[PDB]
Subunit: 225 residues, 2 copies
């Protein structure tokens, strides 16, 4: 689930922080337009950091694994037996009788591709990356982040009073958390009814955190300024 | 690099968005205290979503892989040969001569632990998770996020004028991006001089995005309100 995981980690970040930041700013008697200006500035700034962060990790792991793929094939050139010795240990660790693993290395020495592929598959994990899924990763997380952050900001666009709009945003995102919480469970091995309530509580813990932090800095101001 | 990856993905998120959100709010002639109230509300709301998001994924993957570990051992009980057939394909795909893979399954049938461990190691990846590193993951990403978001907000705490404080925050975080950009390269296979400039440009793209988004909503207001 490459593209399924990318759109899940992107919506959970964009549903919780922009909603929490909005609710916290609305709690401190800020104008609804001000709540929108910091939310959208967060949503835009958030999608780029999530997006390029998903592209930096994907493009770094894709370049490294392909370089180690080349670094390991050059090792079997200079000292072939040392590379054979490393692949022999892989077989040996899993309890193979010596009269059966011996002919395996002899066949592996003639054809390099299969021996290295399995050895690398058994030593450094599945490290051959899809070139199109590296950039597909970044566009899917940035889309899911923008979509997630837009949901808590919709009511502030139609309600110019923030203390009135935050009530529409609490129930709308709470519904969004429970819906996209049970969605992450229908496409996961866990129970979707458990993932719905968990995505709504992380939105509650974060919205409460941003609320308490918003009011502790406004503790000395008479109005929001 | 379990704990090394957790503190990298956490600082890159917390260095870019709180800085960008702050710079965008400061650009629209907002009070420096207002910039702090939305930044810290974002930093707090951001660390919880990053933290519990790292704990939800870790605790879901740890529970699922252990359940599939149990689901697969019960499969070798009802129809042992079907489970043998699945492990036989693993060997067969990598070009094994038939006179050598045959005795391997016979030895694998007597002792279940090694046969399933390798088969699972070769089929469903390395899926046995450390119990202490699942919760260690969440505390390390939340720490790195808070630390990252605090850096762009320090100057606004000592400079009550935002248009004056944003200049101190641009060079301070840009330095932070270049420092923690070359830090992610000294502990990665890529060149650290390349990762420094890349973490500073993602901070530039995001800070510019939040700036343009902050001013497009304030396009009709005479002062920031
Ligand atoms: Co984030
Ligand atoms: Zn090597
Ligand atoms: Zn080797
Ligand atoms: Zn080697
Ligand atoms: Zn199975
Ligand atoms: Zn099987
Ligand atoms: Zn099976």
């Amino acid at each position: 689930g490459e593209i399924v995981r990318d759109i899940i980690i992107g919506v959970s970040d964009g549903l919780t922080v922009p909603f929490a930041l909005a609710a916290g700013l609305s709690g401190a008697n800020a104008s609804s337009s001000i709540v929108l200006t910091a939310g959208i500035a967060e949503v835009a700034a958030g999608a780029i950091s999530m997006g390029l962060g998903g592209y930096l990790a994907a493009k770094s792991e894709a370049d490294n694994y392909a370089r180690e793929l080349k670094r390991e094939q050059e090792e079997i050139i200079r000292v072939p037996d040392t590379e054979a010795a490393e692949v022999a240990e892989i077989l040996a660790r899993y309890g193979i009788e010596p009269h059966e693993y011996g002919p395996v290395v002899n066949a592996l020495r003639k054809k390099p591709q299969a021996w290295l592929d399995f050895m690398m598959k058994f030593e450094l994990g599945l490290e051959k990356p899809d070139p199109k899924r590296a950039l597909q990763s970044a566009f899917t997380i940035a889309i899911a982040y923008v979509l997630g952050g837009l949901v808590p900001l919709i009511p502030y666009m139609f309600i110019p009073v923030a203390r009135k709009a935050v009530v529409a945003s609490v129930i709308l995102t709470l519904m969004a958390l429970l819906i996209f919480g049970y969605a992450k469970g229908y496409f996961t091995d866990n129970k979707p009814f458990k993932s719905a309530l968990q995505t709504a509580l992380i939105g509650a813990i974060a919205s409460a955190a941003a609320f308490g932090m918003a009011k502790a800095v406004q503790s000395e101001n008479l109005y929001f300024q």
